[PDB]
Amino acid sequence: RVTVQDAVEKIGNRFDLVLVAARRARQMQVGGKDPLVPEENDKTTVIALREIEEGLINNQILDVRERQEQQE
Amino acid sequence: SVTEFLKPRLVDIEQVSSTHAKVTLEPLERGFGHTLGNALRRILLSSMPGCAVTEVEIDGVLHEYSTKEGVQEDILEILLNLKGLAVRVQGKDEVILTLNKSGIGPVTAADITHDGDVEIVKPQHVICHLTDENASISMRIKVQRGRGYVPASTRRLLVDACYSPVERIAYNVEAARVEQRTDLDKLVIEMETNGTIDPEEAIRRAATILAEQLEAFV
Amino acid sequence: EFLKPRLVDIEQVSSTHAKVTLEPLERGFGHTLGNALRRILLSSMPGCAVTEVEIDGVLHEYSTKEGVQEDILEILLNLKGLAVRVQGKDEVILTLNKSGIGPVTAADITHDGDVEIVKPQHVICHLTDENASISMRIKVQRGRGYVPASTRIPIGRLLVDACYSPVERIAYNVEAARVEQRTDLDKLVIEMETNGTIDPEEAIRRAATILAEQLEAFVDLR
Amino acid sequence: PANGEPIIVPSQDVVLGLYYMTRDCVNAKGEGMVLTGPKEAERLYRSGL
Amino acid sequence: KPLVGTGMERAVAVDSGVTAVAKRGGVVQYVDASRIVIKVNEDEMYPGEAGIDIYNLTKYTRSNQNTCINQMPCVSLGEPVERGDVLADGPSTDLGELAL
Amino acid sequence: KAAKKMVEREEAVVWDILDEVIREHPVLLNRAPTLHRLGIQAFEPVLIE
Amino acid sequence: EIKELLKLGDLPTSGQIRLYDGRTGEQFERPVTVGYMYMLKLNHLVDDKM
Numbered sequence: 001r002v003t004v005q006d007a008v009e010k011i012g013n014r015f016d017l018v019l020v021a022a023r024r025a026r027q028m029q030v031g032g033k034d035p036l037v038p039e040e041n042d043k044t045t046v047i048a049l050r051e052i053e054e055g056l057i058n059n060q061i062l063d064v065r066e067r068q069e070q071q072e
Numbered sequence: 073s074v075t076e077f078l079k080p081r082l083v084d085i086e087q088v089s090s091t092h093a094k095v096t097l098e099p100l101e102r103g104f105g106h107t108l109g110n111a112l113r114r115i116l117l118s119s120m121p122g123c124a125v126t127e128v129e130i131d132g133v134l135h136e137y138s139t140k141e142g143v144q145e146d147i148l149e150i151l152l153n154l155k156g157l158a159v160r161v162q163g164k165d166e167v168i169l170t171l172n173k174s175g176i177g178p179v180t181a182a183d184i185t186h187d188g189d190v191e192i193v194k195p196q197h198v199i200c201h202l203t204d205e206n207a208s209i210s211m212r213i214k215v216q217r218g219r220g221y222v223p224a225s226t227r228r229l230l231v232d233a234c235y236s237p238v239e240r241i242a243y244n245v246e247a248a249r250v251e252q253r254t255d256l257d258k259l260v261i262e263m264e265t266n267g268t269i270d271p272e273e274a275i276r277r278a279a280t281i282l283a284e285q286l287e288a289f290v
Numbered sequence: 291e292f293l294k295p296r297l298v299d300i301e302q303v304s305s306t307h308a309k310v311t312l313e314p315l316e317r318g319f320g321h322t323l324g325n326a327l328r329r330i331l332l333s334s335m336p337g338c339a340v341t342e343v344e345i346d347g348v349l350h351e352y353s354t355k356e357g358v359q360e361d362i363l364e365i366l367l368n369l370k371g372l373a374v375r376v377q378g379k380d381e382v383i384l385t386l387n388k389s390g391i392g393p394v395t396a397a398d399i400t401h402d403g404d405v406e407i408v409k410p411q412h413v414i415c416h417l418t419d420e421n422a423s424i425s426m427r428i429k430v431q432r433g434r435g436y437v438p439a440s441t442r443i444p445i446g447r448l449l450v451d452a453c454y455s456p457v458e459r460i461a462y463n464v465e466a467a468r469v470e471q472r473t474d475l476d477k478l479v480i481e482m483e484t485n486g487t488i489d490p491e492e493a494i495r496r497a498a499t500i501l502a503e504q505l506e507a508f509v510d511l512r
Numbered sequence: 513p514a515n516g517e518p519i520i521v522p523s524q525d526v527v528l529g530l531y532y533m534t535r536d537c538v539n540a541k542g543e544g545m546v547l548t549g550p551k552e553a554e555r556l557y558r559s560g561l
Numbered sequence: 562k563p564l565v566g567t568g569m570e571r572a573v574a575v576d577s578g579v580t581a582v583a584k585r586g587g588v589v590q591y592v593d594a595s596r597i598v599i600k601v602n603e604d605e606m607y608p609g610e611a612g613i614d615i616y617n618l619t620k621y622t623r624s625n626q627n628t629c630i631n632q633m634p635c636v637s638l639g640e641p642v643e644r645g646d647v648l649a650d651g652p653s654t655d656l657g658e659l660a661l
Numbered sequence: 662k663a664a665k666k667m668v669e670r671e672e673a674v675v676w677d678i679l680d681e682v683i684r685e686h687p688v689l690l691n692r693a694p695t696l697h698r699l700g701i702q703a704f705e706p707v708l709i710e
Numbered sequence: 711e712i713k714e715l716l717k718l719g720d721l722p723t724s725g726q727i728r729l730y731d732g733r734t735g736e737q738f739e740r741p742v743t744v745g746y747m748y749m750l751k752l753n754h755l756v757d758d759k760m
Contacts, residue, residue: 001685046685074336074380074432077500080507097507102435104504106733107329111322111501112508117559118318119292148546156548219291220317221561223545232545240551247709251673255710264551272511279508281292285319286505288294289498325735352621354594359634361594361620391638418592418638513698560736563748626753661750 007052016059017052024048024057077101078256085272091264093271098248098258105257109243112261115278119219122235122268123161125154126216129228136229142207143200147229150200154231157181157197158266159215162189166216171199174208190215193267237274240264292316295323295478300491303481307459308490312478313467320464320476327480328460330497334434337454338376338487340369342429344447351448357422358415365415366450372396372414373485374430375406381431389423392416399428408486457493459483562655570658577659579651581616581632586644589636594618597634597648605644618649628652683708 004017011017025048027033035047037054051057078099086094100108130147132140139146145153161167169187171179179202182195202209218235241263248258263271295312302308315323343366347355354361360368373396376382385400394417397410415424433454443449460482467475482490522530541561547553563570575582585606587599590613599614606612618632632649635656636642647657654660668675687703695701713723721727726741 041681042685074434075496075500077334077503079503082507082512085512095511100504101334103329103333107326107501108504108508110734111326113558114318114322117555118322119316121291152546152548155546221555221559223542223561234552238555239549240554242554249676249708251676252671276509276511279505279511283502283505283509285292285294285323286498286502288296289495290502321735328735329732354620356595357593359592359594359638361631361633364633416638519699564746565748628753 001046001049001053004049004053007049010052010055011059020057020059020062021045021048021052023062024051078250080259083258087271091267091271093261093263093275095261095263095271095275096258097261099250099253099256100248100259101257102255103257105245105259109245109259109261111282112275112278113241113243115282116238116241116263116274117236118221119281120236120238120274120278121217121219122237123159123215123217124233124235125157125159125231126166126214126218126233127228127230128154128211128213130211132210140207140209142202142204143209144203145200151229151231153199154213155234156266157199158193158237158268160191160193160268161215161217164189166214168212168214170210170212172208172210173202174206176203176205177201179209237265237268238263239266292319297491297494298477302490306486307481307483309479309481310490310494312480313475314470315464315476315478317474317476320478324462324464324478324480326501327494327497328462330500331457331460331482331493332455334500335454335456335488335493335496336432336434337456338374338430338432339453339455340372340374340428340450341381341431341433341452342447343369343450344427344429346425346446348446348448350445355424357417357419358424359418360415366448368414369428370450370453372412373408373487375408375487376430376432377404379404381429384428384430385426386414386428387423387425389417390420391418394424456484456488457482458485562658562660566658570660573659574651574654574657575645575647577651579630579632580647580654580657581618581649581651582657583614583616583642583644583646583648585614586642586646587614589638589640589642589648592634592636592638594634595620597636599642599648616648624652679708 007017007021008014011020025044028035028048029044035044035051036056037047037051039047048057078101080097080100082095082097084094084096086096088094097105097108128151130140133147136148143150167187167190169185169190171184173179173183178198179200180195181192181197181199184192200209213231216233218233220236221232221234223232224230241261243262244260245257246260248256250256261275263275265271265274269277293314293316295315297310298313299311300308301311312323345355345362345365348362351363351366358365374384382402382405384402384405386394386398388394388398393413394415395411395413396407399405399407401407417424433452435454437452437454439449439451460480462478462480464476464478467477480494482493484490484493542556547556574580581597583599585599585601587601587605589597590600591598595618597616597618599616601614618634619630621629621631624630630652632651634648635650636648642648647654650656683706685705688706689701690704691701712725716723716725722741724741725745726743728741729738729744730736731738
């Protein structure tokens with residue numbers, strides 16, 4: 001990733017980007033919740049940022065996944 | 073360990089649709105990247121057998137600074153367009169073709185006379201434009217076999233023959249590592265043809281030329 | 291259709307440095323082959339250079355053997371400057387022994403058949419007493435490029451920097467050839483400075499071989 | 513952050529190279545011809561012609 | 562021996578004390594990396610207590626910034642020497658000239 | 662301790678692990694007089710001798 | 711006087727000599743200046759700092 005400006009284009013705040021990326025990366029790093037996008041021998045940080053770029057990650061999908069996880 | 077040199081094998085060939093190639097070689101001994109890149113570039117640029125456009129003559133014109141009605145371009149412009157034209161010719165050294173047509177619209181390379189052995193690699197290419205009802209374009213073009221670049225002054229209108237098929241060739245050297253190996257160079261040949269011959273056959277031809285030039289030594 | 295250059299002439303203008311002529315060549319090929327050969331020769335060549343000197347009456351590489359006027363490290367540098375040639379061995383152990391006042395050069399070194407010294411007059415040290423003997427064992431091995439001491443690493447076995455290189459100054463020039471019923475013929479004259487350990491013909495042959503092997507992957511590109 | 517001026521302004525050696533690359537002299541090799549594109553311009557310059 | 566000097570190299574080298582400048586002209590009888598022995602001229606030597614001169618060149622010893630300070634003989638065996646002239650070239654010196 | 666002795670031995674395996682960790686893992690390069698916020702910038706390391 | 715000393719030698723009066731690039735192997739336009747300058751080594755070694 002040359003830069004994350006596209007992620008800001010997707011999430012204009014430029015700060016919640018960091019929080020959501022870190023949340024996703026922490027969840028997928030320690031264990032479980034395998035990345036949903038192909039990797040390039042990169043660390044969880046890069047793949048999390050790429051997933052945010054792709055648009056499948058947002059401020060609501062993490063919350064709804066947690067809610068469904070809580071429901072079970 | 074007096075002659076054992078790290079024989080490299082390409083790690084990647086990033087090839088684009090038609091004629092852009094990005095060939096990657098590694099590892100190369102200290103400094104060999106620059107010499108190999110330089111030799112390949114010089115061979116591909118200066119000395120390369122090929123066939124291109126040599127001269128052109130127009131029935132209704134006898135001067136470089138003139139024009140024909142119904143052609144919104146200029147005869148200098150059609151010369152420039154013919155410069156980029158690409159053709160493949162059999163062992164026959166020379167051949168003459170023509171653009172004899174009378175129609176309305178762009179003059180495409182497909183319109184040129186097929187003329188048997190010769191082969192046009194970019195028929196879709198546009199040479200000039202015609203729009204008037206009676207404006208007819210007729211000219212004689214001579215294509216000849218050569219092995220370099222011949223400007224006009226080095227020598228009916230003249231056409232500088234870009235015999236060599238490489239349009240843009242550039243190379244780069246970046247540090248590459250093999251375990252504790254100090255600093256091994258990795259070569260990146262970014263190269264572009266005109267479409268007559270694919271990039272890889274051109275690289276192979278240049279390598280063979282230089283090898284035959286070296287066969288006299290060993 | 292291009293005609294390759296033959297090794298037309300070798301002119302040993304001097305014992306150490308020579309000039310070779312390559313003919314015929316076509317336009318552009320001159321500077322091409324000249325630069326390629328220059329880079330190959332300066333970069334990678336076979337060579338014979340001192341690698342491990344051991345002096346009997348020495349504990350470390352910084353002391354001063356009594357009787358020799360120059361410090362021991364200066365002796366190591368002089369030995370590094372020594373030129374030697376071998377044929378059938380990847381390493382060899384020479385021996386030097388000398389006492390009595392006077393210069394001690396490479397000439398007095400042991401002269402094993404395969405071992406050949408090219409510059410006997412080249413000085414190694416001096417002795418300043420009637421009874422003051424220097425005795426050393428010199429391990430010289432083949433190699434390539436440059437290999438410093440600290441990298442490839444007894445207490446008396448001194449280590450020196452490797453200088454595997456027989457060529458120090460290479461230059462080339464392309465000029466016109468005879469008529470030969472064809473103009474634009476380029477003759478390539480390469481002037482090469484060599485300490486005296488490698489034959490220029492062998493040097494050019496080896497450089498061409500190296501370039502060919504490097505190109506052989508290009509010809510066999512996948 | 514001080515102002516809108518770019519901070520990655522090329523400094524001293526890059527600028528000299530670029531400036532020497534684009535500077536017209538009255539006449540030189542290749543003066544007065546027509547090129548179909550930048551590619552053959554590079555080909556002409558690097559070849560020394 | 563710096564090529565472009567200002568002619569002050571002599572003074573700095575000789576007076577800095579690093580170079581073992583001679584004391585009484587003579588002939589270099591015995592030379593060595595360790596010591597240099599000088600046969601002073603009879604005219605230059607006192608009648609009594611005749612003797613000869615000996616300089617013990619300082620070898621590799623720690624300098625106060627941990628750089629090496631050392632001397633090397635710069636006179637060949639059996640050569641004349643003038644009174645007050647350099648005999649050993651201290652660090653960063655040669656032939657009694659400041660070469661840093 | 663096995664990894665400690667490995668890194669001390671400079672085992673060739675360690676370098677591959679280094680290329681793995683350094684793959685994309687920014688580090689901060691800061692100068693001495695940090696005046697403006699640009700005085701600290703992140704950078705992707707590229708191991709070099 | 712510097713030009714005079716150069717004249718006693720066999721080197722260009724201006725002091726500029728054309729140089730050939732090591733990699734490409736072709737000439738540099740606009741001859742460059744080459745001479746012998748006396749250069750020191752200062753007591754700031756990287757391995758003392760790194």
